[PDB]
Design an enzyme around this catalytic site. Structure first.
Site, mmCIF file in Angstrom:
data_model
loop_
_atom_site.group_PDB
_atom_site.id
_atom_site.type_symbol
_atom_site.label_atom_id
_atom_site.label_comp_id
_atom_site.label_asym_id
_atom_site.label_seq_id
_atom_site.Cartn_x
_atom_site.Cartn_y
_atom_site.Cartn_z
ATOM 1 N N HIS C 89 28.205 5.619 69.335
ATOM 2 C CA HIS C 89 28.918 5.876 68.072
ATOM 3 C C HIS C 89 28.473 7.196 67.506
ATOM 4 O O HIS C 89 27.507 7.779 67.936
ATOM 5 C CB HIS C 89 28.623 4.743 67.056
ATOM 6 C CG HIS C 89 29.036 3.387 67.516
ATOM 7 N ND1 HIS C 89 30.348 2.950 67.492
ATOM 8 C CD2 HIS C 89 28.273 2.367 67.979
ATOM 9 C CE1 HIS C 89 30.344 1.705 67.963
ATOM 10 N NE2 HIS C 89 29.100 1.323 68.241
ATOM 11 N N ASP C 92 32.123 11.308 61.672
ATOM 12 C CA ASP C 92 32.885 12.503 61.224
ATOM 13 C C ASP C 92 33.244 12.276 59.754
ATOM 14 O O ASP C 92 33.919 11.325 59.402
ATOM 15 C CB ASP C 92 34.203 12.541 62.005
ATOM 16 C CG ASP C 92 35.216 13.644 61.650
ATOM 17 O OD1 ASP C 92 35.185 14.220 60.532
ATOM 18 O OD2 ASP C 92 36.143 13.930 62.487
ATOM 19 N N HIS C 94 35.364 13.791 56.765
ATOM 20 C CA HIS C 94 36.397 14.763 56.420
ATOM 21 C C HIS C 94 35.980 15.631 55.237
ATOM 22 O O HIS C 94 36.608 16.664 54.994
ATOM 23 C CB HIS C 94 37.702 14.057 56.085
ATOM 24 C CG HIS C 94 38.413 13.439 57.254
ATOM 25 N ND1 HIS C 94 39.672 12.918 57.100
ATOM 26 C CD2 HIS C 94 38.107 13.299 58.573
ATOM 27 C CE1 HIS C 94 40.091 12.472 58.276
ATOM 28 N NE2 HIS C 94 39.184 12.686 59.197
ATOM 29 N N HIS C 129 34.831 8.556 59.512
ATOM 30 C CA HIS C 129 35.068 7.614 60.597
ATOM 31 C C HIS C 129 34.262 7.958 61.804
ATOM 32 O O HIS C 129 33.884 9.137 62.013
ATOM 33 C CB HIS C 129 36.574 7.527 60.923
ATOM 34 C CG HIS C 129 37.185 8.799 61.410
ATOM 35 N ND1 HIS C 129 37.137 9.217 62.720
ATOM 36 C CD2 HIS C 129 37.893 9.747 60.747
ATOM 37 C CE1 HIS C 129 37.787 10.373 62.814
ATOM 38 N NE2 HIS C 129 38.267 10.727 61.638
ATOM 39 N N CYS C 130 34.059 6.972 62.672
ATOM 40 C CA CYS C 130 33.474 7.232 63.980
ATOM 41 C C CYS C 130 34.493 7.978 64.834
ATOM 42 O O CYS C 130 35.693 7.810 64.667
ATOM 43 C CB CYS C 130 33.121 5.900 64.594
ATOM 44 S SG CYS C 130 32.309 5.978 66.177
ATOM 45 N N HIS C 139 37.642 3.312 68.366
ATOM 46 C CA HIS C 139 36.607 3.026 67.353
ATOM 47 C C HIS C 139 37.196 2.940 65.955
ATOM 48 O O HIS C 139 36.858 2.044 65.188
ATOM 49 C CB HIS C 139 35.485 4.038 67.399
ATOM 50 C CG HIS C 139 34.591 3.844 68.567
ATOM 51 N ND1 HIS C 139 33.241 3.613 68.440
ATOM 52 C CD2 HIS C 139 34.878 3.844 69.890
ATOM 53 C CE1 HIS C 139 32.744 3.473 69.665
ATOM 54 N NE2 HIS C 139 33.709 3.584 70.567
ATOM 55 N N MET C 144 35.941 1.168 62.245
ATOM 56 C CA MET C 144 34.792 2.055 62.011
ATOM 57 C C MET C 144 35.180 3.269 61.181
ATOM 58 O O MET C 144 35.265 4.415 61.678
ATOM 59 C CB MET C 144 34.172 2.405 63.343
ATOM 60 C CG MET C 144 32.707 2.667 63.204
ATOM 61 S SD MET C 144 31.834 2.444 64.818
ATOM 62 C CE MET C 144 30.271 2.999 64.148
ATOM 63 N N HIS C 249 51.074 0.445 45.970
ATOM 64 C CA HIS C 249 51.865 0.087 44.798
ATOM 65 C C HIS C 249 51.182 -1.078 44.099
ATOM 66 O O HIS C 249 50.759 -2.028 44.734
ATOM 67 C CB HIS C 249 53.245 -0.361 45.276
ATOM 68 C CG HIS C 249 54.147 -0.792 44.183
ATOM 69 N ND1 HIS C 249 55.145 0.038 43.726
ATOM 70 C CD2 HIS C 249 54.221 -1.905 43.427
ATOM 71 C CE1 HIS C 249 55.739 -0.508 42.698
ATOM 72 N NE2 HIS C 249 55.230 -1.708 42.493
ATOM 73 N N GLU C 273 55.377 4.989 40.843
ATOM 74 C CA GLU C 273 55.562 3.587 41.237
ATOM 75 C C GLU C 273 54.809 3.310 42.546
ATOM 76 O O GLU C 273 54.123 2.300 42.654
ATOM 77 C CB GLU C 273 57.057 3.176 41.315
ATOM 78 C CG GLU C 273 57.881 3.850 42.385
ATOM 79 C CD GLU C 273 59.363 3.623 42.277
ATOM 80 O OE1 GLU C 273 59.791 2.435 42.217
ATOM 81 O OE2 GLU C 273 60.115 4.628 42.289
ATOM 82 N N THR C 274 54.953 4.234 43.485
ATOM 83 C CA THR C 274 54.457 4.113 44.835
ATOM 84 C C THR C 274 54.145 5.546 45.278
ATOM 85 O O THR C 274 54.785 6.490 44.795
ATOM 86 C CB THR C 274 55.535 3.516 45.754
ATOM 87 O OG1 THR C 274 55.933 2.258 45.207
ATOM 88 C CG2 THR C 274 55.038 3.304 47.145
ATOM 89 N N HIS C 300 53.581 -0.838 50.153
ATOM 90 C CA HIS C 300 54.964 -1.188 49.864
ATOM 91 C C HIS C 300 55.938 -0.999 51.020
ATOM 92 O O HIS C 300 57.156 -0.906 50.785
ATOM 93 C CB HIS C 300 55.462 -0.570 48.538
ATOM 94 C CG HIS C 300 56.469 -1.387 47.802
ATOM 95 N ND1 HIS C 300 57.726 -1.623 48.282
ATOM 96 C CD2 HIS C 300 56.422 -1.974 46.587
ATOM 97 C CE1 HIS C 300 58.403 -2.343 47.395
ATOM 98 N NE2 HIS C 300 57.643 -2.574 46.348
HETATM 99 O O1 LIG Z 1 38.276 13.873 61.739
HETATM 100 N N1 LIG Z 1 38.788 13.639 63.001
HETATM 101 O O2 LIG Z 1 39.583 12.784 63.148
HETATM 102 O O1 LIG Z 2 57.280 -4.642 43.306
HETATM 103 N N1 LIG Z 2 56.814 -5.458 44.320
HETATM 104 O O2 LIG Z 2 57.102 -5.209 45.434
HETATM 105 CU CU LIG Z 3 31.997 3.924 66.881
HETATM 106 CU CU LIG Z 4 39.412 12.374 61.167
HETATM 107 CU CU LIG Z 5 58.181 -3.637 44.736
#
Ligand SMILES: O=N[O-]
Ligand SMILES: O=N[O-]
Ligand SMILES: [Cu+2]
Ligand SMILES: [Cu+2]
Ligand SMILES: [Cu+2]
Ligand SMILES: O=N[O-]
Ligand SMILES: O=N[O-]
Ligand SMILES: O=N[O-]
Ligand SMILES: O=N[O-]
Ligand SMILES: O=N[O-]
Ligand SMILES: O=N[O-]
Ligand SMILES: O=N[O-]
Ligand SMILES: O=N[O-]
Ligand SMILES: O=N[O-]
Ligand SMILES: O=N[O-]
Ligand SMILES: O=N[O-]
Ligand SMILES: O=N[O-]
Ligand SMILES: O=N[O-]
Ligand SMILES: O=N[O-]
Ligand SMILES: O=N[O-]
Ligand SMILES: O=N[O-]
Ligand SMILES: O=N[O-]
Ligand SMILES: O=N[O-]
Ligand SMILES: O=N[O-]
Ligand SMILES: [Cu+2]
Ligand SMILES: [Cu+2]
Ligand SMILES: [Cu+2]
Lengths: 334, 334, 334
Positions: C89, C92, C94, C129-130, C139, C144, C249, C273-274, C300
């Site tokens: 393992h 990384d 970001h 993440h790994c 992974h 992970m 949402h 909303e979303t 959603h």
């Molecule tokens: O941050 N590499 O997926």
């Molecule tokens: O607004 N519920 O999906």
């Molecule tokens: Cu891993």
């Molecule tokens: Cu990444």
């Molecule tokens: Cu909705």
């Protein structure tokens, strides 16, 4: 406030892609805006092949109608589930605050009705949809969704705070359907909603729509039902997708001002070619037409558009501008 | 204006990921910028397994070349379909206004050519692609797409209106391919384009690409063709996807300034880890390198990147900064 | 600077969706913030059916914990791979610059540990993440991944530059799993990680998750583990997805201020909303609760939410506001 002291106005909704009459800049103080919708379960033919599904609709259409109010109006919806229907339904407004958007307060069996009121406290375009506990995506993906526009009381504004005024508005509801397929890839058919449910769930769990349509069917916004405009007109296109991402694009045009996630307190994105409306959202794009002719309005996953159904047309009237575009040498053999 | 009074400049395009010579800030008034592209249908090996498809290309490459002009220049494209090709083709510029982006005016059979002119009225990076009526996604997903950059005449600007100047530019075109599979999951092969069409459509309708590649093939932007930079250089990466969403990410870096939907009148998003370029869009990300070594540039659906092909490399030269990152205790057993 | 002259503070992380204690506005100068994580490969039951997978975790949980620092602090992570694990393992970030986010410097076999330091030069929420070379998505999609929040030193700000202060914070990690299926559509089971690998790859290449969950399992953020708030409280929800797009949402609410792509130097989007969090990104949404009761917090794509697992609950305490929403006529037959 005593809501009983406010004006009331009633609206009879119109069928998408048209929108009921309204005023962009509010001509009155806050009001209670009364709407009535009648749920209709009905058969619908969704493609050129004749594939027929059992749709679940608000007011007989897919999508349901566009409601239009202003910020801090109250929306009072009378929701009717006639005894000719089979299923339980309700409504969730993404514009509303509390009780699952209204869904916890509006469960209606066949033969029942209810009236919900909410305050439209945030400006934007928003999805509304049915959402009965335990069977939410089945109702939504059977067509039971629409949108509501909550305009700022002083209308729309550009990125500098100047007014934007549309001449025409259209509402494009985009629907992902999941018609179950057998091993051979053939559509399956069902005799009752209860006998349909498990294979409906299985089909949804593929995350692969069989159809993705505007206004309820392949080709619905074409031909005699193409959208229309004239050169120089300002057009707002409201676009919703209650369940799945889309990426609208006007072929031959742009979104001059786009609220991709639909909320008007934000500045619009300018000059978009294509924009992402996430599933569960309504967005809005404003464009001033500059050339006549046929346009296609599409989800720009072009497979989704041209193979699965997510394409409509505009027919635009007026003078061709050769400065903007011209054929210098028409196709020919030399 | 009499367009005949304007300067003309000719460009011979270069192969992606490189970009033809240009000036960020316009050194002349508006011009007619002349480009020629020759369509080539050709076999292409797209993966390490040796899978060979029949690609449809602008200028012999997937993606097609990046064209660069300034706002309110005119683009005059001579499009040639030699008689060695089999199919009808055309071109739609998302930068253009009218006639389906040009597609309605540029239909060329094998043995024909055409010249289109349009005014580049909106600044941004934009997709261009083939779009023959009735078979649009087949051409696009066979590789027939590229991009055009329309720079503001005073170059790029940051979120405060200050200049941003790139030292290097690269164009990454990302292509979703849909090679048909049989029941066993094995690739199918075809003898003519007409015999391929229905299974091509069926494969597209799965909405599941078999390959997602940069510069036309798995590993194309690696090894001797890795992208390069030095520590302290400012690099613009233009990224397009004509059909399907992508989410670019520089592994070990950022997008310092990102126009995720590609339109330069908007302020960029700052400090992005990852950004969404919707299908049908070009985006642009600006980064100043701060560390040397190998970077991977990916679509951050990591399955798409590392299993399906959407990954390239940068090799960056210069001094390591231990303030920014260091191994305090190298991996060891204690 | 001599990093040895800076304060050091140690944090023992807490299990998601909770977040270790911290201060929004920095109460000290820049610091070295010390974290330790221990990798644990373990069986996890992910659904109501009892489906059990071999998960790969940071600190025993899916997602891994949320780390919180301020801009221009240094993060010093001690990463331990005990000899009870089987696999290689790494990590990384970001948030970090150089060496593939740290992955090139942190490869640990079972029985090894390492300590990495990096400077958190950009404010935002970010994925970690790994990412072991050659087996990255396996992974990540085995659980992970987690997130790190790098707060501006003067805390969060609204679109006008005014302070935003949260009362509560939660971290929702959303995980796409790809449990392999046979011809019948039944889950397959495996005896060792090496025997699992090829079918894991094949399942990932479908691009169709079998499960999409919050906090590691269907229903994990429900019941006795529902999220909680009171009316009037300001809540920040950090949401990450290391591999695949999501669209969060709050059912019955909104995102009052949303950094959909998670980077705090940008103004937030208002009244969402979303919102779309691209795969490979963390986002953050701020909401002030205005109504009590049960809310659902969902991806959603409602199939993803209600069929595949991407749904949790809030239970909110306080006074109901009938101005904001009321049942005018409860459901009834007339
Ligand atoms: O941050 N590499 O997926
Ligand atoms: O607004 N519920 O999906
Ligand atoms: Cu891993
Ligand atoms: Cu990444
Ligand atoms: Cu909705
Ligand atoms: O007037 N709406 O049914
Ligand atoms: O209901 N959808 O257009
Ligand atoms: O149509 N009766 O409710
Ligand atoms: O009809 N039930 O609320
Ligand atoms: O620009 N038409 O896809
Ligand atoms: O309205 N245009 O001739
Ligand atoms: O278009 N006249 O060659
Ligand atoms: O110079 N373009 O073929
Ligand atoms: O044509 N696509 O890289
Ligand atoms: O190559 N003849 O067009
Ligand atoms: O070659 N047809 O326009
Ligand atoms: O250019 N860096 O040593
Ligand atoms: O990295 N030296 O233990
Ligand atoms: O305190 N973190 O393991
Ligand atoms: O690790 N994902 O919630
Ligand atoms: O648990 N030994 O590393
Ligand atoms: O344990 N290898 O860096
Ligand atoms: O805290 N609300 O009663
Ligand atoms: O809700 N009372 O009819
Ligand atoms: Cu319903
Ligand atoms: Cu073509
Ligand atoms: Cu297009």
């Amino acid at each position: 406030v005593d809501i009983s002291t406010l004006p009331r106005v009633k609206v009879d909704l119109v069928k998408p892609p048209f929108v009921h009459a309204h005023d962009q800049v509010a001509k009155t103080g806050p009001r209670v805006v009364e709407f009535t919708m009648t749920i209709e379960e009905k058969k619908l033919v969704i493609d050129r092949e004749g594939t027929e599904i059992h749709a679940m609709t608000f007011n007989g259409s897919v999508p349901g109608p566009l409601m239009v109010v202003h910020e801090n109006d109250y929306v009072e919806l009378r929701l009717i589930n006639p005894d000719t229907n089979t299923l339980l339904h309700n409504i969730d407004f993404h514009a509303a605050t509390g009780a699952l958007g209204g869904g916890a307060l509006t469960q209606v069996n066949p033969g029942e009705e209810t009236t919900l009121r909410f305050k439209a406290t945030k400006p934007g375009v928003f999805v509304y949809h049915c959402a009965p506990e335990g069977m939410v995506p089945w109702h939504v993906t059977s067509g039971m969704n629409g949108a509501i526009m909550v305009l700022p009381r002083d209308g729309l504004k550009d990125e500098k705070g100047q007014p934007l005024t549309y001449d025409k508005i259209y509402y494009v509801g985009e629907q992902d359907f999941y018609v179950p397929k057998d091993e051979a890839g053939n559509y399956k058919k069902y005799e009752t909603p209860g006998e349909a449910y498990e294979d409906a769930v299985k089909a949804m769990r593929t995350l692969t729509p069989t159809h993705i349509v505007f206004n309820g069917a392949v080709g619905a916004l074409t031909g005699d039902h193409a959208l229309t405009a004239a050169v120089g007109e300002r057009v707002l296109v409201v676009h919703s997708q209650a369940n799945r991402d889309t990426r609208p694009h006007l072929i031959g045009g742009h979104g001059d001002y786009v609220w991709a996630t639909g909320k008007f307190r934000n500045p619009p994105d300018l000059d978009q070619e294509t924009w992402l409306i996430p599933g569960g959202t309504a967005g809005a794009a404003f464009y001033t037409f500059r050339q006549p002719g046929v346009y296609a309005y599409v989800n720009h996953n072009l497979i989704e558009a041209f193979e699965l159904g997510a394409a409509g047309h505009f027919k635009v009237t007026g003078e061709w501008n050769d400065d903007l575009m011209t054929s210098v040498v028409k196709p020919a053999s030399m």
